[PDB]
């Protein structure tokens, strides 16, 4: 297994906005509760799951585990930077697997709730 994505770097300033606040307090909470959240709450263990080509195909892995630690350490500059990590987490499941698989359908159901909940983030960002 490779190192997981890092959740803080001492050279990057820390910034919090009202949207990043609502993103960890509400959206993540709902997404972490979903029925199909358990395969995406931590970095994929390609060894125990016997996926030897996973990290050779997925060059930018992502999970809600690291997304949460990034919201907590203020790794993200704005809300856009966080939303981009969910899209990449979803598309990873779509790139590595084939259409119509179960894990694909679990990520699709999990994405439809994500796009629904981020429509609740404040339309005007406040620092
Ligand atoms: O397969 C899983 N659970 C059932 C199980 C059965 C037997 C032994 N061990 C576990 C599983 C999959 C992902 C997970 C998150 S993203 C992602 C992906 O993109 C492709 C795969 N695959 C490909 C083929 O299907 C099985 C595993 O898995 C994942 C994350 C997980 C999983 O279970 C344990 C913890 O987190």
Numbering used by the authors: 44 to 170
Give sentences copied directly from the paper behind this entry.
BRD4 contains two bromodomains, BRD4BD1 and BRD4BD2, that recognize acetylated lysine residues in histones and non-histone proteins. Of the four members of the BET family proteins, BRD4 is the most thoroughly characterized, and its aberrant activity has been associated with NUT midline carcinoma, colon, breast and prostate cancers, neuroblastoma, and hematopoietic cancers. BRD4 overexpression has been shown to promote tumor growth by stimulating transcription of major oncogenic drivers, such as MYC. In this study, we report the biological activities and mechanisms of action of thienopyranone (TP)-based inhibitors with increased potency toward BRD4 and selectivity toward BRD4BD1.
SRX3212 displayed an IC50 of 3.7 nM toward BRD4BD1 and 32 nM toward BRD4BD2, and therefore was ~ 65-fold more potent inhibitor of BRD4BD1 and ~ 48-fold more potent inhibitor of BRD4BD2 than SF2523. Importantly, SRX3212 retained its high inhibitory activity for PI3Kα as measured by a kinase screening assay. These data demonstrate that the pyrid-3-ylmethylaminocarbonyl benzodioxane moiety markedly increases potency of the TP-based compounds for BRD4 without compromising their activity toward PI3K. In all complexes, the thienopyranone moiety inserts deeply in the binding pocket laying parallel to the α-helices of BRD4BD1, whereas the benzodioxane moiety of SRX3212, SRX3212P and SF2523P is oriented toward the ZA loop of BRD4BD1. The carbonyl oxygen in the thienopyranone moiety of all compounds forms a hydrogen bond with the amide nitrogen of Asn140 and a water-mediated hydrogen bond with the hydroxyl group of Tyr97 of BRD4BD1. While the nitrogen atom in the piperazine ring of SRX3212P and SF2523P is unrestrained, the oxygen atom in the morpholine ring of SRX3212 is involved in a water mediated polar interaction with the carboxyl group of Asp144, which likely accounts for a sevenfold increase in potency of SRX3212 compared to SRX3212P. Although the hydrogen bond between the side chain amide of Gln85 and the dioxane moiety of the thienopyranone scaffold is conserved, restraining SRX3212, SRX3212P and SF2523P, the presence of the pyrid-3-ylmethylaminocarbonyl benzodioxane moiety in SRX3212 and SRX3212P altered the hydrophobic contacts with Trp81. The indole ring of Trp81 flips over ~ 180° in SRX3212 and SRX3212P compared to this ring’s position in SF2523P, enhancing its interaction with the benzodioxane moiety. The short 3.5 Å distance between the pyridyl moiety of SRX3212 and the methyl group of Leu92 suggested an additional methyl-π contact that might explain the enhancement in potency of SRX3212. We have developed and characterized one of the most potent BRD4 inhibitor to date, SRX3212, with an IC50 of 3.7 nM for BRD4BD1.
